[model samples]
Target: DVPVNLYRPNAPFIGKVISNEPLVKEGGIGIVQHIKFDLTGGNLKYIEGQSIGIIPPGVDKNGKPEKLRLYSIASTRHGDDVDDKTISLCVRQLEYKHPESGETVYGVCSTYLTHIEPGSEVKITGPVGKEMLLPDDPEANVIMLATGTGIAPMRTYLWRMFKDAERAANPEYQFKGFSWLVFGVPTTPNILYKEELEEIQQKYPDNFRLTYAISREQKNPQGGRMYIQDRVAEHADQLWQLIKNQKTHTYICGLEGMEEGIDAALSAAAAKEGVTWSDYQKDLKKAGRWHVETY
Candidate 1:
């Protein structure tokens, strides 16, 4: 048998947990935990849309050093520039039944974070996962699609953009494009940072749009659970218009199976306009309009 090599960053770093606060509790289908770490003395570096790999120590049964998992940074780089050299991670807790004991096995990172007090020390590696980085052009429009904890990176990107918007040379200045966030959850209570999202929408009314899909709530007259894809499908005409007219960029982050459904919906929408779906996708890829991050 061949040896299995786990991935690690070329340069490792250490940090201390400055704050670990629960933004959303675990009970429903989603949980968003806000964890801030101080990297004052570490070699960690990250851009606005980058992610970090956390090397969570494994249990004795798993191994000694343990396998690592990557999580996107939800805090902006401006937070660091403003003397708050801290990065926040929004994590989702995973629960599974233990095989031998029949108890529950909480997620490694989630449990670690939930149990850590302020000023606790933890080692992490990265500023990795380049696929989620922001585009080079500051003028490009951005559309963010996320569900559950996938909102982490989107939060980072938006926060950074907002920061730049605030510090622009012209007080009345605005970035040259738009941003849309399509988020999904099982119910209203399970929606993470609903108030903050609303606040952002209010602040950037002309440039930002947010759509929420509550999947387990009462069905609409159509009698189907509304998902993130549903929201996008409902706005297909507008989305297509944006893609065709403006150089809009799209980012989708969530569970494994949802991307295909969204792709199908987009394809169907294109077909309705007498264009081949492959042609639409080809245009999107050629223009760097589509980006996906899924596990």
Candidate 2:
């Protein structure tokens, strides 16, 4: 059952800030934070693929209350410390230059979340969403494609599938399947959660694969900046092969900019096998084998 009152507005749960750490190094593109909240006072339980909403302080230009903004959850059901009383979010402060004013503007909720201090009271709501849930099959093949803060859901997937503590805690869900994470970012310094991701890959080499698209540092075969779509093209055949399997699931998250290129890459690869990518993708969607969450 849903926590009806907790999910309702105007009386949101009051969670205390636990930490707000920088997700990138010096000279990184933008401010992204790994923020955690202490849910000890409330029963704020959530699954890995669900999202929570944050109602920022103050009102908009129309003078109405600031609406809640949903962010994908970045931690497993069990909290980061293997306790169940915490919820963490990966937020990138949305910044852009006003077209006419030519002045920088930042996202209200993201700014609030990124600048929050420890122990401060914060308003939070929701453990919503069901589309991104992982399959229960222990040997299911999972392919995750993410970029920037899109790593949120994939982080949870990784922890659930490979974290030592998570494995120990979820005895019934020990994953024996393969998981491949192809993450796209701007630079080497922009590889968010670099240490943890690689550690999992190192520890479970057979079960995990980590690939990156470091635009400023890495290059495609044509010597241009390497992007996530380019990486998809590189391994299109293998990905297509995996997608053909009934037990395989593909998840695409992050920005919408890369969607077309990735689809085109996959379409060409599928064509080589005499299968229409569009038609097959429709079948996958109908069968709940393809998942997508982008913003």
Candidate 3:
């Protein structure tokens, strides 16, 4: 009973903006926002790992109306305040220099979200996507790898697993297993949801683990900027063991190319155990234990 496409683009839900707060710290590199919407007038039921579409207002370069864009949900099904009447997104304004004109160009949807004022009406669609759904097993070990805004769905999972309020809300689910998050970002300030993440780790030290890959401030053993893949390589043996367990589930999200290096690291570890990583990954996939939603 998964919720998908509850709201379509043809007839979207009009949600009012509640707040749009800056997520990045004082010395962060880019603009990231934690924007929440008041879904009081509508029912947008969504589970963890689902995404919602935002249809930005106004026309595009072609003079046609702008299209919708999907962003992973950053809050759990019960919502951030545990009221179940709100939904939120973690959006990083997409900014890049134009190759030909050398002028900065901002993403239409992202800029719209980042600058959207509180109480304004927004056209939203879909509590869509199913690839990143959290497993129902309360005792399953979860390993999450994320970068940038990829932490959206992972945040949902963590809140569901460790948040005291969330635990109170879900009487049928009580996590009794371990969770590890390996997050990569450009700087410490860019580690989105830093305080909340660390607080959960502190409260549940034995059940949760947190690691960071701060590219600008940290270095790998090779004397280069540390990345998520380097962290995976550093703990590939341990990760491989967890993956081998029948009760363990793994999730990977963020930039698309991360899988290549992660596979390489896991491959080496599996090789040491006389198991082919490619073959074992297929088995995990078949078992619905390896979930990835990278783009």
- Quick one: best lDDT, which candidate? 3
Clashing pairs in 1: none
Mind sharing the TM-score for model 3? Answer: 0.98
lDDT of 2 at 221: 97
TM-score of every prediction relative to native: 0.85, 0.96, 0.98
Q: Write the per-residue lDDT of candidate 2 for residues 243-293, one digit (tens) a residue.
A: 888999998899888788899999999999788999999999999989999
**Which stretches of model 3 miss by more than 4 angstroms?**
none
Q: Local error of candidate 3 at 74, Å?
A: 0.4
Q: For model 1, how does the per-residue alpha-carbon lDDT over 1-295 read when each residue is reduced to its tens digit?
A: 1111222454456678887677764555545678888878754556656677777766546566666787877876545334546777887777777674658777777777666778877767766665666675667788888988788878876766665443452244346578889898887777777787888889889878988888888464478888887887888777766766556788888777878767776777777789876777777776667777887
lDDT of 3 by residue, 1-114 (tens): 898887899999999999999999999899999999999978789999999999998898789999998899999998899999999999999989767454888899999999
Better of 2 and 3 by lDDT: 3
Q: Which candidate would rank higher by lDDT, 1 or 3?
A: 3
Overall local distance difference test of candidate 3: 0.94
Q: What does the lDDT come to for candidate 2?
A: 0.90
Candidates, ranked, lDDT: 3, 2, 1
